[PDB]
Structures are given as structure tokens and as C-alpha cells.
Amino acid sequence: MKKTYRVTLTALGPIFIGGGEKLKKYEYIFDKQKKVAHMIDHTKFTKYLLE
RNA sequence: ACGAGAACAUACGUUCUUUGAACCAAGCUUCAACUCC
């Protein structure tokens, strides 16, 4: 009879769903030597280079 | 030197009036953005 339940999925390990977006060696990826990575948007990158 | 001669079966008149090709019906069902090294 439509037994609705609230599922709280506790991520005990690394959870990855992907979704079809591959990031190449230097293609939108910005990896620096302080053990964090930043990533960029294609539109503002391309117009920031074309300006 | 014909039961004959002469004589439009003719004139007038809307296949027309009223009438939803409608009513009902999920583009949906089942799918891990993934496996290997």
C-alpha cells in the first residue's frame, strides 16, 4: 500500500556515479601542488582567452 | 388531289432545411555510466 520510506544512504566508502564527463590532463582541470584541485567552466575560460 | 390541313407536351419551381467525426485512453513498461587491465 505504497509504503514510503526515507532512505539515508551513509556513504561508508567512496561513492561515484560519473554521468559521462571525462576530464583530461589539462582540459578544464586545474591541479596545483597544495593537494587540492579547482575546475573551471568552458564558457568563461574560452571568452577569458578570446578577450 | 391521303379522316385531312395548321399546332414545341410547353410555361412556372434552389435536391433543399436541421446535424461538432465525436466520446473514452499516461509515449509508456523493464534498465546502476558501467566493466576490465
The C-alpha cell at A9 is: 544512504
> Is any atom of strand B within 7 angstroms of residue A16's beta carbon?
yes
Q: Which of A3, A7, A2, A49 is nearest to A28 (CA)?
A: A49
Torsion of CA A30, A33, A35, A41, to 10 degrees: -10
Spatial distance from the CA of A18 to the C1' of B14 (Å)? 78
Spatial distance from the CA of A32 to the C1' of B10 (Å)? 114
CA gap A29, A49 in Å, rounded: 16
Name the structure determination technique.
cryo-EM
- With a CB cutoff of 8 Å and minimum separation 6, the contacts of A36 are none
Nucleotides of B under 7 A from a protein CB: 33-34
CA gap A10, A15 in Å, rounded: 10
Spatial distance from the CA of A29 to the C1' of B35 (Å)? 26
Resolution of the entry in angstroms: 3.0
CA-only gyration radius of chain A, Å: 19
